[PDB]
From Swiss-Prot, chains A, B:
General function of this protein: Ionotropic glutamate receptor that functions as a ligand-gated cation channel, gated by L-glutamate and glutamatergic agonists such as alpha-amino-3-hydroxy-5-methyl-4-isoxazolepropionic acid (AMPA), quisqualic acid, and kainic acid. L-glutamate acts as an excitatory neurotransmitter at many synapses in the central nervous system and plays an important role in fast excitatory synaptic transmission.
Processing and modification events after translation: Palmitoylated. Depalmitoylated upon L-glutamate stimulation. Ubiquitinated by RNF167, leading to its degradation.
Classification of source organism: Eukaryota, Metazoa, Chordata, Craniata, Vertebrata
Compartments it resides in: Cell membrane; Postsynaptic cell membrane; Postsynaptic density membrane
Name recorded for this polypeptide: Glutamate receptor 2
Disulfide bond annotation, renumbered to this chain: C203-C258
Length: 258, 258
């Protein structure tokens, strides 16, 4: 009956409300995806329960145990009925789960501490003083591990062998590493997260260069789910009406601190 | 059997080659979608025949008869098996045909003759000395007809009742109208076509302001098509291989003449 929604604590998509300990259920959270979940649920006619993914990961298949972790795993093993999060539509995921059309368009980008003498991925590749990495588990890391493009393959060769590790467990961790590294660490992450952080105090980071690729985030459901069709139609309707743009403005720029 | 592909003569997606007179079948054409069709067919294992949509339209439903025209109609009534073209993924279309994940991201934009005193949608709506319109039977026209957003609603009320008509049969007609209007006509079209034309002689037009929305083009198939699943996964593979970005640079950037 009640649809179990798996999501992730990733700002500004889902965050704990300041007074969450005094609130119950869905009311404990706020964010772009919290607002989107309420709308998808109204338009599809279902009751739901927001739940934060237990391992705090997006979703990758372990080469070895072949088990899917993160939000993708929750859907694959039937622990959740739908994922409403900044989950990237990728070929490997689409093979095991269904995705609505994109509710957000984006691409991999570079985040630097202001003043870092880096303007592009080519710049990062040709040097070694400034370290750089990605989220330890996700579509960004996979983009690099599989690129057949020279500059990106060179970047992957470096990243996968860098010691100490240049990979981070969460986006917040990558952001803090950039902030505390005096310009010696650049972070590769999705343009959406980059743009958000650029509008957050202490306003010491910046998005540089163009996006490395083009892709989108989709609402995911277990392969063959009853919800897929309606959820997809809802995403298309909300985009055409302008709600998605409204929500991005609300969470990225209307409340910007810089 | 041989897959009948419906497409549209729209630069730089599908254009007749220079020496087309001495050529046959698929060899008569070139463009982004011609290359995309070859890739899709290779990956999905099918032979095909490129056919240009009979009525030269993208696809809209007649309010009276409820009959679909354009490439959409060809799929709906079984005249074609798949549409590989700059066909916009929309809610009304998604209800009658299937769309793969987007192979290209875009948004509605404004095309002006160089020097025209317009910097955005808001500017067009504020005055009436400069006429502006859209393509007939497409997603752009629907966008303005179904928009509750103040500026867009106002622009639509002007366009709908405009005399002479500000609507055009083909993108080429819209571009030619802007070029010969002495700056008295602006044209609303997708950013993709806009930026392509911006880089072509006589280099007298330009895209102004940001996109009005964010959407994508998808490869479409009739509901229940045996090809749907495979073409969708093929689009995801091409994007990740970097092939889609390669074709985009090939047909837009390289060979840009301004
Ligand atoms: N949305 C990404 C997670 N992730 O966020 C980034 O910024 N990079 C990255 O891999 C995914 O779905 O795997
Ligand atoms: N891709 C559009 C056709 N069209 O091209 C534009 O530039 N505007 C417009 O409506 C469609 O699929 O209807
Ligand atoms: Zn709503
Ligand atoms: Zn290929
Ligand atoms: Zn009629």
């Amino acid at each position: 009956k009640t649809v179990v929604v798996t999501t992730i604590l990733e700002s500004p998509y889902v965050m704990m409300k300041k007074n969450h300990e005094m609130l119950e259920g869905n009311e404990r959270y706020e964010g772009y995806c919290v607002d989107l979940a309420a709308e998808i649920a109204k338009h599809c006619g279902f009751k739901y329960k927001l739940t934060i993914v237990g391992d705090g990961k997006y979703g990758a298949r372990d080469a070895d145990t072949k088990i899917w972790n993160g939000m993708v795993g929750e859907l694959v093993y039937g622990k959740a009925d739908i994922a409403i999060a900044p989950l990237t539509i990728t070929l490997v995921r689409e093979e095991v789960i269904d995705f609505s059309k994109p509710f957000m368009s984006l691409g991999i980008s570079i985040m630097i501490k202001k003043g870092t003498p880096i303007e592009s991925a080519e710049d990062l590749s040709k040097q070694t003083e400034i370290a750089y990495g990605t989220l330890d588990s996700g579509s960004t890391k996979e983009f690099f591990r599989r690129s057949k493009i020279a500059v990106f393959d060179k970047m992957w060769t470096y990243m996968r062998s860098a010691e100490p590790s240049v990979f981070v467990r969460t986006t917040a961790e990558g952001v803090a590493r950039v902030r505390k590294s005096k310009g010696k660490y650049a972070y590769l992450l999705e343009s959406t997260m980059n743009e958000y952080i650029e509008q957050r105090k202490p306003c010491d980071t910046m998005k540089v260069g163009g996006n490395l690729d083009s892709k989108g985030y989709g609402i995911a459901t277990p392969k063959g789910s009853s919800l897929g069709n309606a959820v997809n139609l809802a995403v298309l309707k909300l985009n055409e009406q302008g709600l998605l743009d409204k929500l991005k403005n609300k969470w990225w720029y209307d409340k910007g601190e810089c």
